[PDB]
Design an enzyme around this catalytic site. Structure first.
Site, PDB file in Angstrom:
ATOM      1  N   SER A 203      32.516 -69.365 -37.258  1.00 54.57           N
ATOM      2  CA  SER A 203      32.582 -67.989 -36.711  1.00 54.57           C
ATOM      3  C   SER A 203      34.035 -67.609 -36.309  1.00 54.57           C
ATOM      4  CB  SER A 203      31.583 -67.838 -35.546  1.00 54.57           C
ATOM      5  OG  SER A 203      31.220 -66.482 -35.374  1.00 54.57           O
ATOM      6  N   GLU A 329      23.360 -64.956 -42.497  1.00 56.27           N
ATOM      7  CA  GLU A 329      24.418 -64.772 -41.509  1.00 56.27           C
ATOM      8  C   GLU A 329      24.112 -63.681 -40.500  1.00 56.27           C
ATOM      9  OE1 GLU A 329      26.979 -66.515 -40.845  1.00 56.27           O
ATOM     10  OE2 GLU A 329      27.521 -67.634 -42.650  1.00 56.27           O
ATOM     11  N   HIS A 442      23.228 -67.769 -38.366  1.00 58.46           N
ATOM     12  CA  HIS A 442      24.614 -68.052 -38.057  1.00 58.46           C
ATOM     13  C   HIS A 442      24.632 -69.209 -37.078  1.00 58.46           C
ATOM     14  CE1 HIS A 442      28.731 -66.583 -37.998  1.00 58.46           C
ATOM     15  NE2 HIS A 442      28.756 -66.593 -36.673  1.00 58.46           N
TER      16      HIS A 442
HETATM   17  C1  LIG Z   1      25.907 -59.066 -24.947  1.00 59.72           C
HETATM   18  N1  LIG Z   1      26.091 -57.996 -25.944  1.00 59.72           N
HETATM   19  C2  LIG Z   1      24.770 -57.440 -26.316  1.00 59.72           C
HETATM   20  C3  LIG Z   1      26.813 -56.888 -25.280  1.00 59.72           C
HETATM   21  C4  LIG Z   1      26.840 -58.517 -27.137  1.00 59.72           C
HETATM   22  C5  LIG Z   1      26.274 -59.807 -27.773  1.00 59.72           C
HETATM   23  C6  LIG Z   1      26.969 -60.232 -29.078  1.00 59.72           C
HETATM   24  C7  LIG Z   1      26.054 -60.938 -30.093  1.00 59.72           C
HETATM   25  C8  LIG Z   1      26.148 -62.475 -30.082  1.00 59.72           C
HETATM   26  C9  LIG Z   1      25.892 -63.197 -31.415  1.00 59.72           C
HETATM   27  C10 LIG Z   1      24.519 -63.865 -31.461  1.00 59.72           C
HETATM   28  C11 LIG Z   1      24.336 -64.937 -32.541  1.00 59.72           C
HETATM   29  C12 LIG Z   1      23.723 -66.222 -31.961  1.00 59.72           C
HETATM   30  C13 LIG Z   1      24.115 -67.561 -32.616  1.00 59.72           C
HETATM   31  N2  LIG Z   1      25.564 -67.899 -32.658  1.00 59.72           N
HETATM   32  C14 LIG Z   1      26.434 -67.011 -31.835  1.00 59.72           C
HETATM   33  C15 LIG Z   1      25.860 -69.269 -32.253  1.00 59.72           C
HETATM   34  C16 LIG Z   1      25.962 -67.894 -34.051  1.00 59.72           C
END
Ligand SMILES: C[N+](C)(C)CCCCCCCCCC[N+](C)(C)C
EC number: 3.1.1.7
Lengths: 537, 531
Positions: A203, A329, A442
């Site tokens: 990432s 992704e 992801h």
């Molecule tokens: C908090 N707000 C809503 C404002 C923003 C959150 C941003 C999204 C986070 C990415 C989620 C993917 C989970 C898995 N990973 C990150 C490990 C790939």
């Protein structure tokens, strides 16, 4: 010192460290956890480039992970493993610049190839101390020397008033670069070979690896690079100087800080850490997913031009890269903001919801560009099918943000002399707690690369444990030689280099390596060649 | 005197001719006048009905072909000569032809009316490929075909003027349609069961009769082969016709509307034809200078507006395309293309080609076309580029306009049947690379392979029998399926959700879904929003 384990006392430039003997399934490894590589960037040093750690006297205890860099903590689904495993597993603090070393026990007899891991988390979160990043398996099974560092995230790492001295920007990349310089100077003390250093990251970690590739001072600190599901080019990894200034100025305004750069930064400095975090998301131009407020900035210094301009004109002849993506992704990002989507149902959506989701996934698109996306992704035989619409929404987010920038990166590096190997990771972990419809989300290849399935008490299947062994083998072979293929190994199928001519990449899953051609080539032409010109005229 | 060859129509008495069909006799009545000759001062004017005649009118030969440009790209080559006039050229050309069984149908028979293609600048009802004898003999059909005015003669418009109102070639078709209503029963035709069919410009003609009220009470069913009234080449705006007529006049020394047409009417036919091609706004292929105009009269609005708002509930329609609609067009202007080599082209030539094939495209829209048709694994392969060029021309002008029409008619109540024609004639003289070109299914619909002296394969003779059966079943009932043949798969109606159509080839019917659906989304939905 009398009764301590002799294999755990090491001196580095700043002094003596005591590490810890850890158990891995196959046997013991050595860990040195929470080594400081910088002066604590607190008080008047907030937003500032990091300074080399001042030497200590006595024996520094390096047996536990140290503080995690101050960050937003995800609470979308409290208690849920799918999100909690990415949350900090140590107390937050601005005093966070530490790195971690795993090596075989006893430390290797002769200079050993070094893997340096850079975590992801949108440049607003992450930590080198997460369970999924545990270096003991690679250190024990492969004999690797493994290093991972904390670096500042969010405002503390990337808030910038470009041109100023008090907040130059990119200080989070500078933390990473300091850790790389530390590895040059000290890794031999651990039995590592400073003349063979591979960066790897996923990432934002991958985009960071990417930026060290594109930044000349960093270029003398490593030899090979692995970018997992992230690139320096693309719509989220960087901002212009102007856009960084706007965002910093708005955040200051939102926390009560009034005109010139010195006054403004002094006031931000001043504010409690949690205050900056509490307002960090408020500064984004549009409603959006896969956009982060404080990211690397095009400053004309660390980045001397946009990453797109740099990959287009660089000579990459001395360079070996491994790049790749997971199958889905975008799926996990949808539940963070696209209405209609949730981890607790199937998320079947209508055409209306899909169009509204596109405006959020592609925030920079005009009504014409958005229509182009919606038309490209529609299934014209089943235009109302809510399953396809849901998978279209995921592919839109995944393709625009990761798959197509990666394909583009691979294409440019290859065209300009780099040895490139490409993969799509396709196995869904039997242990995954996100829903089935999210496919292979992801981050969920990590995990296999760090060889967690090797832990008898994690409840992976035998096939998964074998698969983990294969992935560690490819990764360390690449680190070792610039080539993921096992040179001795006759029977196996070969992973070919990616090239512009043949566009060959491999599938990573439970079955043997299968060679495929063209990485979403039609769709990436849409995103990389057509869409930009639409948004231009 | 053979009584089976004597017919009394409203204009008087007629005598036809007994022709040989491989199966047996048919009656033919060729060169029946349906209108006063549109000569002299009737040039550019609506047709008037033919005055009564005396005695017995000899209707035993095809009459003059309407004055038109004659293709001289490949002199003496079958591939082009077969579409060229096979009778003398003349402005005196408003004649129609009728074939029936021999003896004449005992009971009222469904009538097929053929409207030829030729880009609105050419064609004749007299070409060997339009020979009605096979359908008459094998299926017992009453077949009618008419000449209609083409080029400046049929379509030069000064919209708003009394003396060159436009669309007079369509009015000729309409007059022939009314004539069938009034007279065909004398031949044993059923005026209560009339089916239009046509190919290319003739399919566009059929579509215009569907979208024009006075025409709608003259026929019941329609077949549109490889053309439609919508699309980029079948109509022009009032403003664009006035522009072209004024430019043609200027090119021939002429001279207010009245004075300009008066001088055009003094010009020999060939002087008009001579400058016909110099009036197009852009270098292009698949564009024709003098075509139907959106006059606010014959066409009360653009074909697109009319298909989008029409109620088509009482209508049945058969529509389709050949497999390689654009290929034959490339040799008429696109640099790098020829019938005498394999026409392998470069990327530069593909883009230069797109500018000529999609003349209205801006740089960005031209880039969109090129990006969409590129094969991203082999972006330089000359064979793919050549085939892509053909697909761009075929999809933009025929396939995707057909898809749009089919979708709209079905959404608005029509029963619709759709086909892709995929058999390349063993007898074809265009090169292999052209695949199955525009025009080359007509041969089979008319049943020419039933003629032993033409030596199609046995498999093609059977094939031709199937297609004659489909077409006449459709004329008979509005459904091409055989109401006594209990055999799979049935040809299903095209609907906007399932999008089912069939491939017509040597193998049995195969049902497919979505008529180049992705690509047609590009042309019909994205590309217009882009310009
Ligand atoms: C908090 N707000 C809503 C404002 C923003 C959150 C941003 C999204 C986070 C990415 C989620 C993917 C989970 C898995 N990973 C990150 C490990 C790939």
């Amino acid at each position: 010192e009398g009764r301590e384990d002799p294999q755990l006392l090491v001196r580095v430039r700043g002094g003596q460290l005591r590490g810890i003997r850890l158990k891995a399934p196959g046997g013991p490894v050595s860990a040195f956890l929470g080594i400081p590589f910088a002066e604590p960037p607190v008080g008047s040093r907030r937003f500032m480039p990091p300074e080399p750690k001042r030497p200590w006297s006595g024996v520094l205890d390096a047996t536990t992970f140290q503080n995690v860099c101050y960050q937003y903590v995800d609470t979308l689904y409290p208690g849920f493993e799918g999100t909690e495993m990415w949350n900090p597993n140590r107390e937050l603090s601005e005093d966070c610049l530490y790195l971690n070393v795993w090596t075989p026990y006893p430390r290797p007899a002769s200079p050993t190839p070094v893997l340096i891991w850079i975590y992801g988390g949108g440049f607003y979160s992450g930590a080198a101390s997460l369970d999924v990043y545990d270096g003991r398996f690679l250190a024990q099974v492969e004999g690797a020397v493994l290093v991972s560092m904390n670096y500042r995230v969010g405002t503390f790492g990337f808030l910038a008033l470009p041109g100023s001295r008090e907040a130059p920007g990119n200080v989070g990349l500078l933390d990473q670069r300091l850790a790389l310089q530390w590895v040059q100077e000290n890794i031999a003390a651990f039995g590592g070979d400073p003349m063979s250093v591979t960066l790897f990251g996923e990432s934002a970690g991958a985009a960071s690896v990417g930026m060290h590739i594109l930044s000349l001072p960093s270029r003398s600190l490593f030899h090979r690079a692995v970018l997992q599901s992230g690139t320096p080019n693309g719509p989220w990894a960087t901002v212009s100087a102007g856009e960084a200034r706007r965002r910093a100025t708005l955040l200051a305004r939102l926390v009560g800080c009034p005109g010139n750069d010195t006054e403004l930064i002094a006031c931000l400095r001043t504010r409690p850490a949690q205050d900056l975090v509490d307002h960090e998301w408020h500064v984004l131009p549009q409603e959006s997913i896969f956009r982060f407020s404080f990211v690397p900035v095009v400053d004309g210094d660390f980045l001397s031009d946009t990453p797109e301009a740099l990959i287009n004109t660089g000579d990459f002849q001395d360079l070996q890269v491994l790049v790749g993506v997971v199958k889905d992704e975008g799926s996990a990002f949808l539940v963070y903001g696209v209405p209609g989507f949730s981890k607790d149902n199937e998320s079947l959506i209508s055409r209306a919801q899909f169009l509204a989701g596109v405006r959020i996934g592609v925030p920079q698109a005009s009504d014409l560009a958005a229509e182009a996306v919606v038309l490209h992704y529609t299934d014209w035989l089943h235009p109302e099918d809510p399953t396809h619409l849901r998978d279209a929404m995921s592919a839109v987010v995944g393709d625009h943000n990761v798959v197509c920038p990666v394909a583009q990166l691979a294409g440019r590096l290859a065209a300009q002399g780099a040895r490139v190997y490409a993969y799509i990771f396709e196995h869904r972990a039997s242990t995954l707690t996100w829903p089935l419809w999210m496919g292979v989300p992801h981050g969920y290849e990590i995990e296999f690369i760090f060889g967690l399935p090797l832990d008898p008490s994690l409840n992976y299947t035998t096939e998964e444990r074998i698969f983990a062994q294969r992935l560690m083998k490819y990764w360390t072979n690449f680190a070792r030689t610039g080539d993921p293929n096992d040179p001795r190994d006759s029977k196996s199928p070969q992973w070919p280099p990616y090239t512009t001519a043949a566009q060959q990449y491999v599938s990573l899953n439970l079955k043997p390596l299968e060679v495929r051609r063209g990485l979403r080539a039609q769709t990436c032409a849409f995103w990389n060649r057509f869409l930009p010109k639409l948004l231009s005229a």
